Symmetry: C6
Subunit: 219 residues, 6 copies
């Protein structure tokens, strides 16, 4: 990653064994549960494109997903190249060349180039641009591997309302509902999918009940 040291210059630091192992283990334990994504982003704080490739390449399973991710990265790289074409022909001696999509993705750029871009004044933030593409891909994977429609999350007859609400919003998160819908689903599908006893209680609460109030009501 690129870090400020103790004396305020941005320099390269090797990726730590602790970081490498954290990432491999979270993928082993959680697969593509949605909360793996913010974990990736956090563990990749300050990453160069080289570091992001290290993290992705250290994954041993899930090669269908990793191939889908390669496809998404190629699409974003191709769109970058449409927006920001680069001068063909020889670079100015000693000067910084402009990054192409594959340079951002770390496949045709050196670590030194990456460092140069990222520590330029002002920085050409190749690590952050690539990380956005990766996360775009990972979010597709999450949605793909979500095993259950929100329509099929219904409260069982002796299921505690809290355990049902947990299943409901765990499902909405993987299915990738916007916050609008998450905020909104509470006046609607959450009540619809509730068991008959709790449904009666919730119907009687009136509109504009908070989730807290719904949860208390069906406790």
């Amino acid at each position: 990653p690129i870090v400020q040291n103790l004396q305020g210059q941005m320099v390269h630091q090797c990726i730590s064994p602790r970081t490498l192992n954290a990432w491999v283990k979270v993928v082993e334990e959680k697969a593509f549960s949605p909360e793996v994504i913010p974990m990736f982003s956090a563990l990749s704080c300050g990453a160069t494109p080289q570091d992001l490739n290290t993290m992705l390449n250290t994954v041993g399973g899930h090669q269908a997903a990793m191939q889908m991710l390669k496809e998404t990265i190629n699409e974003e790289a191709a769109e970058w190249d449409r927006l920001h074409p680069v001068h063909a022909g020889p670079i100015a001696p000693g000067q910084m060349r402009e990054p192409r999509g594959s340079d951002i993705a770390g496949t045709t750029s050196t670590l030194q180039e990456q460092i140069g871009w990222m520590t330029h004044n002002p920085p050409i933030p190749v690590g952050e641009i690539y990380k956005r593409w990766i996360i775009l891909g990972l979010n597709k994977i999450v949605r793909m591997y979500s095993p259950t429609s929100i329509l099929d999350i219904r409260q069982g007859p002796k299921e505690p309302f809290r355990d049902y609400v947990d299943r409901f919003y765990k499902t909405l998160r993987a299915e990738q509902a916007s916050q609008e819908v998450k905020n909104a689903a509470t006046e609607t599908l959450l009540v619809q999918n509730a068991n008959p006893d709790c449904k009666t209680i919730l119907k009687a609460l009136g509109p504009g009940a908070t989730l807290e109030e719904m949860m208390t009501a069906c406790q």
Copy 2:
């Protein structure tokens, strides 16, 4: 987080793998037992709003709770915006803009903005303001998930008085009794809910017995 380095300037540092894993594990092991809250506060020492969102987003279960927390944060954000409206229209070139509620919550502000606010002279402590909102929400969650009324904590006939007192104050903590009440419950409900043998001994101690003295008396 924002830390002073070895040479006394406040700078950003990535959230550590050790911190990320500590938080995920304490939620996995303890859920919303009350002592998770001071753990959160401690693990979030110096956090930016981005870091606080990382911590909350890395939680995989408990999505009912996390949706209730979103609701509490939205309420606090809305109250901030009432108290501190911001100038609409274009920002002064190169200057610091005033944070809105959603900026404090990290959803409409960049890391750079956050850093700017937090390291301003004097600091606009967006991390500490957001952390207060989060803890307000978490405390509601704790109270919600408290499974037992203090009225139902009674000493069993062969229950050691110490084990009963532990249950009693463990319950009062989750139910969120003030210190007044915790201090006070010792002249009252603690004795009432004691078994007949210990109740007789405690009644005879007189008023103004310390808990230590009550515990010794029923040993």
Copy 3:
């Protein structure tokens, strides 16, 4: 905690995940065995009052003990306030206010105030003053939870003398005997409570035998 950095100024540093977890685990594994106290003191090296409260608040069980500790802290705070009353009315602009008992305990003082006191020249050592109160309380707890009188530690007929001596001094430590008594118990109760065979051997050694010599004699 407050630490000197690499360049010799005293500054605040966040409490580490390693420290937080060490403390929670030692309480989980050892409860209020006497050796938990020096562990607390060591893990709280350099602590602010905020940090000491973090450590105490992160404890999830033992709430009878934690309520007894609150009582002891309140008593010490009240005695501080007797000895060191503070000027009522407004503080001098920009100047340091004098700490009250509850300020020392971290309940009515900010982290900034604490830092100010602790790094004043000369330091008003609020962390060390509070830590003394806490340890006073913890020592009472240890004594309370000591399950066995020294009178009841007697060597079994086929109990190795070393295993008996271990039980004896493990008991004296929890019961909180002074070093005088620990030094002294060797000419007396240790021999009295020894089995008939070893008692004869020890009686014959004469007075002024070291523990080493007693242990060798009954090997």
Copy 4:
């Protein structure tokens, strides 16, 4: 390794216990699965030739592989020596000598020499040159230990299409297919090797289907 310190000079630092153990454990757990290679590269960030030899020598099993790797390194060393012969006869007093293949491999050069080369202006990057040779060898090992031809990866009749795709691309990775082929295999062998039901669905999608679209279609 050679690291920049806190003040921006490149200096030698001992290999850490954490690094040493990470590498030994990944070889113990994963053998020569392809993802061990990017792990090696990452754990060897900044390594001297001495450090790379340490890592290879700390491996206890797999001695057939380690002997094959020695053979590959000897071949690369011999090709270096063809391209870059060195002046025989005595070195200039106090001056840097030119590295031979065995110097790059760390077998005839001292740590001091290595440091000298690597921190020269401009650096003679002996660590990076050796690491390339090692990785060339490791890639051969991976290919050797790949147990299954891509021709034999066929979707079972009740095998989820995702689990088949995972096996397929896990195999292609060990067999060391180029990205061209990985990108391409999706219009061809992946469909051919699919079970009859999914094969019909994929045939009907048309050419130019993404893997994402194929995966959705056979869900």
Copy 5:
């Protein structure tokens, strides 16, 4: 401990959680096996008397041993006081007082005093003086808890000579034989205590056989 920082002044640093836990665990796992002593010395590198007391006080079992150790420390303290009596009466304002035995042992000296002594020019090395006393005591404990005489280590009839030699020198180490005797025991008791078959082979080797040669001969 007292450490040099990054800029070459000797300053105090808190004892680490890793150090505290290492020591507690080695005592839990190994008791007073001889190799615990060099572990203690190493884990106490740079320790103040306060730190050494922390380490000893964090031990929960073995209180017979810890009482024997207190006795040894008191004896060494008393001998220090004989050799180095201190001026009674008031200290020179602002000046360093001379340490008494109990000051060296950390029981009547503050951390500040200790730091003062240890960082004086030239240092009055109270940490190293106390550590020597402690190790003197620990060595007595080791010898006490050694369960087997060297006379009783004899090679069994189907015992591999190497396993017998391991038992032999493991015993000599706990029994605290000098290196002279360890060096010497090889021409004598080691052969005597060997089984009849190996004894014949060793007798025939001649005098002045190395242990290596004896071990090869009885392989």
Copy 6:
């Protein structure tokens, strides 16, 4: 160890708990398998003679080996003393004395002396000299504890050729064959000791087959 700090002076640093535990555990788990030696060398990076003795002394088992190692160190010390006799009689005030063998081994030299030698300009590298003696001894131990002759490593009739090659070169490593022999054994003993089926295939390959080619041929 002696390390450069953040500002480029060589100073002493305590041996870490992580290093101490790494070494004890590798000896516990691997005994004197050959790969323990490069682990020792790596974990002892920068070590003083004191540190090397710490590492050796922290080993609890294997006392036959540790006594053999003492013998080897004494032999090397005696040869050093032959090559580099020291001036008897009093040292020049304030000046550096010349190290004797036992000084190099850390038994008659202080840490301060060691530091002085190792940080002299130019360094008298006592740590590296002692480490060479130790490794000489450890290599003898490895060879001693090698349980199997290379003559007895033969491919079983249904043993995969790769598993046989692993046994073969694992044996050659412990038996301490030179690289010449390891390189060479491939045209000879490896084929001889192969099972009849693979032997026929290898005989037919011709001379000058690489190990890779032999392994492929018998796959």
